[PDB]
């Protein structure tokens, strides 16, 4: 195995909102930031992959 389990360093995987491709949002976010941005992405926010961001 390996060991990488630390606070802040959190991998919140969402998607490219236009190709459904997996965006593992590797962030360094405290629990409450992670929670808050969870609610935003659950609500209305979403991201795009750099391929789609370059294409449209
Ligand atoms: Zn995309």
UniProtKB/Swiss-Prot annotation:
Which intervals hold the zinc fingers (unnamed)? 16-52
Q: What is its main location?
A: host cell
What GO molecular functions are on record for this protein? Answer: DNA binding; DNA-binding transcription factor activity; protein domain specific binding; zinc ion binding
Q: Name one GO cellular component term.
A: host cell nucleus
Q: How is it modified after translation?
A: Highly phosphorylated.
Question: In chain numbering, where does the motif Nuclear export signal fall?
Answer: 34-42
Question: Which domain of life does the protein's organism represent?
Answer: Viruses
Its keywords, alphabetically, are: Activator, DNA-binding, Early protein, G1/S host cell cycle checkpoint dysregulation by virus, Host cytoplasm, Host nucleus, Host-virus interaction, Inhibition of host innate immune response by virus, Inhibition of host interferon signaling pathway by virus, Interferon antiviral system evasion, Metal-binding, Modulation of host cell cycle by virus, Oncogene, Transcription, Transcription regulation, Viral immunoevasion, Zinc, Zinc-finger
Record-level GO BP terms = DNA-templated transcription; symbiont-mediated perturbation of host cell cycle G1/S transition checkpoint; symbiont-mediated suppression of host innate immune response; symbiont-mediated suppression of host type I interferon-mediated signaling pathway
The Swiss-Prot or TrEMBL record describes its family as follows:
Belongs to the papillomaviridae E7 protein family.
**What is stated about domains?**
The E7 terminal domain is an intrinsically disordered domain, whose flexibility and conformational transitions confer target adaptability to the oncoprotein. It allows adaptation to a variety of protein targets and exposes the PEST degradation sequence that regulates its turnover in the cell.
Q: What is this protein called?
A: Protein E7
Record organism: Human papillomavirus 45
Q: Output the lineage of the source organism.
A: Viruses, Monodnaviria, Shotokuvirae, Cossaviricota, Papovaviricetes
